[PDB]
Design an enzyme around this catalytic site. Structure first.
Site, PDB file in Angstrom:
ATOM      1  N   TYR A  53       1.014  -0.334   0.093  1.00 11.29           N
ATOM      2  CA  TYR A  53      -0.083   0.114   0.300  1.00 11.29           C
ATOM      3  C   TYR A  53       0.911   1.264   0.002  1.00 11.29           C
ATOM      4  O   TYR A  53       2.402   1.118   0.417  1.00 11.29           O
ATOM      5  CB  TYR A  53      -1.410   0.404   1.403  1.00 11.29           C
ATOM      6  CG  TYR A  53      -0.267   0.550   2.689  1.00 11.29           C
ATOM      7  CD1 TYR A  53       0.623  -0.616   3.083  1.00 11.29           C
ATOM      8  CD2 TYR A  53      -0.003   1.871   3.177  1.00 11.29           C
ATOM      9  CE1 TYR A  53       1.334   0.325   4.572  1.00 11.29           C
ATOM     10  CE2 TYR A  53       0.621   2.174   4.093  1.00 11.29           C
ATOM     11  CZ  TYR A  53       0.740   1.091   4.480  1.00 11.29           C
ATOM     12  OH  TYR A  53       2.014   1.293   5.006  1.00 11.29           O
TER      13      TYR A  53
ATOM     14  N   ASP B 126       3.440   8.291   2.758  1.00 16.77           N
ATOM     15  CA  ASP B 126       3.642   6.590   3.436  1.00 16.77           C
ATOM     16  C   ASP B 126       3.397   5.870   2.719  1.00 16.77           C
ATOM     17  O   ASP B 126       2.466   5.650   2.460  1.00 16.77           O
ATOM     18  CB  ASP B 126       4.157   6.157   4.958  1.00 16.77           C
ATOM     19  CG  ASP B 126       4.627   5.744   5.401  1.00 16.77           C
ATOM     20  OD1 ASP B 126       4.274   4.242   4.965  1.00 16.77           O
ATOM     21  OD2 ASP B 126       5.389   5.684   6.255  1.00 16.77           O
TER      22      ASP B 126
HETATM   23  C1  LIG Z   1       2.177   4.916   8.918  1.00 24.64           C
HETATM   24  C2  LIG Z   1       0.527   5.472   9.814  1.00 24.64           C
HETATM   25  C3  LIG Z   1       0.034   3.991   7.864  1.00 24.64           C
HETATM   26  C4  LIG Z   1      -1.732   4.091   8.872  1.00 24.64           C
HETATM   27  O1  LIG Z   1      -2.212   4.900   8.739  1.00 24.64           O
HETATM   28  N1  LIG Z   1      -1.656   3.042   8.480  1.00 24.64           N
HETATM   29  C5  LIG Z   1      -0.935   1.704   8.156  1.00 24.64           C
HETATM   30  C6  LIG Z   1      -0.496   0.584   7.083  1.00 24.64           C
HETATM   31  C7  LIG Z   1      -2.724   0.670   7.469  1.00 24.64           C
HETATM   32  C8  LIG Z   1      -3.527   1.156   7.573  1.00 24.64           C
HETATM   33  C9  LIG Z   1      -2.854   2.298   9.213  1.00 24.64           C
HETATM   34  C10 LIG Z   1      -2.974   1.981  10.048  1.00 24.64           C
HETATM   35  O2  LIG Z   1      -4.519   1.082  10.088  1.00 24.64           O
HETATM   36  O3  LIG Z   1      -1.710   2.027  11.012  1.00 24.64           O
HETATM   37  C11 LIG Z   1      -2.137   0.942  12.369  1.00 24.64           C
HETATM   38  C12 LIG Z   1      -1.314   2.357  13.648  1.00 24.64           C
HETATM   39  C13 LIG Z   1      -2.070   1.511  14.683  1.00 24.64           C
HETATM   40  C14 LIG Z   1      -3.425   1.387  14.836  1.00 24.64           C
HETATM   41  C15 LIG Z   1      -3.629  -0.164  14.916  1.00 24.64           C
HETATM   42  C16 LIG Z   1      -5.702  -0.299  15.249  1.00 24.64           C
HETATM   43  C17 LIG Z   1      -6.197   0.877  15.393  1.00 24.64           C
HETATM   44  O4  LIG Z   1      -7.528   0.769  15.378  1.00 24.64           O
HETATM   45  C18 LIG Z   1      -7.706  -0.527  15.780  1.00 24.64           C
HETATM   46  C19 LIG Z   1      -5.905   2.644  14.998  1.00 24.64           C
HETATM   47  O5  LIG Z   1      -6.806   3.026  15.472  1.00 24.64           O
HETATM   48  C20 LIG Z   1      -6.389   4.600  15.598  1.00 24.64           C
HETATM   49  C21 LIG Z   1      -4.403   2.563  14.928  1.00 24.64           C
HETATM   50  C22 LIG Z   1      -0.584   0.504  12.536  1.00 24.64           C
HETATM   51  C23 LIG Z   1       0.519   0.856  12.039  1.00 24.64           C
HETATM   52  C24 LIG Z   1       1.724  -0.050  11.600  1.00 24.64           C
HETATM   53  C25 LIG Z   1       1.196  -1.466  11.623  1.00 24.64           C
HETATM   54  C26 LIG Z   1      -0.239  -1.761  11.431  1.00 24.64           C
HETATM   55  O6  LIG Z   1      -0.502  -3.284  11.963  1.00 24.64           O
HETATM   56  C27 LIG Z   1      -0.040  -4.397  11.469  1.00 24.64           C
HETATM   57  C28 LIG Z   1       1.572  -4.354  12.641  1.00 24.64           C
HETATM   58  O7  LIG Z   1       1.390  -4.073  13.985  1.00 24.64           O
HETATM   59  O8  LIG Z   1       2.699  -4.741  12.809  1.00 24.64           O
HETATM   60  C29 LIG Z   1      -1.133  -1.229  12.518  1.00 24.64           C
HETATM   61  C30 LIG Z   1       0.072   5.387   7.099  1.00 24.64           C
HETATM   62  C31 LIG Z   1       0.123   5.833   5.942  1.00 24.64           C
HETATM   63  C32 LIG Z   1       0.094   7.041   5.402  1.00 24.64           C
HETATM   64  C33 LIG Z   1      -0.394   7.423   5.740  1.00 24.64           C
HETATM   65 CL1  LIG Z   1      -1.911   9.570   5.439  1.00 24.64          CL
HETATM   66  S1  LIG Z   1      -1.330   6.731   7.667  1.00 24.64           S
END
Ligand SMILES: CC[C@@H](C(=O)N1CCCC[C@H]1C(=O)O[C@H](CCc1ccc(OC)c(OC)c1)c1cccc(OCC(=O)O)c1)c1ccc(Cl)s1
Length: 123
Positions: free
Chosen positions: A45, A54
């Protein structure tokens, strides 16, 4: 651009139909199966605010679907994806980081955009 296209033509995949998570399929995937809650999902992604960007295409980004491991928009949106599908998701803050944000990178009340490719999913 891609976020505007999602706004205009995207399907509201929220249960509440509050346009919190809008999706367009950009590349159609294979067959009909889409992952169930508990399945292990493998994606590539990249995403950005509607200025911060990112990107994860070496190791896949891996998580278990529907277990609260990612933001709610991903538990909702990735669940709708076929293997091989690429999708765009435009996400209101209620389905992402809400009012708290995730500082310093993510401000309060941020809208997020993602391009997601679902590589595979397993039980
Ligand atoms: C760098 C943050 C990233 C981001 O927002 N995400 C990363 C990719 C998946 C979607 C989203 C995300 O859920 O971020 C989450 C952030 C933490 C989080 C988890 C659960 C949540 O609600 C249930 C939550 O809510 C606030 C935040 C995350 C980031 C890195 C890894 C992960 O799971 C796998 C593991 O822990 O190894 C999960 C973005 C990229 C570009 C953006 Cl504007 S935001």
């Amino acid at each position: 651009g891609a976020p505007a296209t999602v706004t205009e033509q995207g399907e509201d995949i929220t249960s509440k139909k509050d346009r919190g998570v809008l999706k367009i399929v950009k590349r159609v995937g294979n067959g009909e199966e889409t992952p169930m809650i508990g399945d292990k999902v493998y994606v590539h992604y990249k995403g950005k605010l509607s200025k911060k960007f990112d990107s994860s295409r070496n190791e896949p980004f891996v998580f278990s679907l529907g277990k609260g491991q990612v933001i709610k928009a991903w538990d909702i949106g990735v669940a709708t994806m076929k293997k091989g599908e690429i999708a765009h998701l435009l996400i209101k803050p209620e389905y992402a980081y809400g009012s708290a944000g995730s500082l310093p990178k993510i401000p309060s009340n941020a809208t997020l955009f993602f391009e997601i490719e679902l590589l595979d999913f397993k039980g």
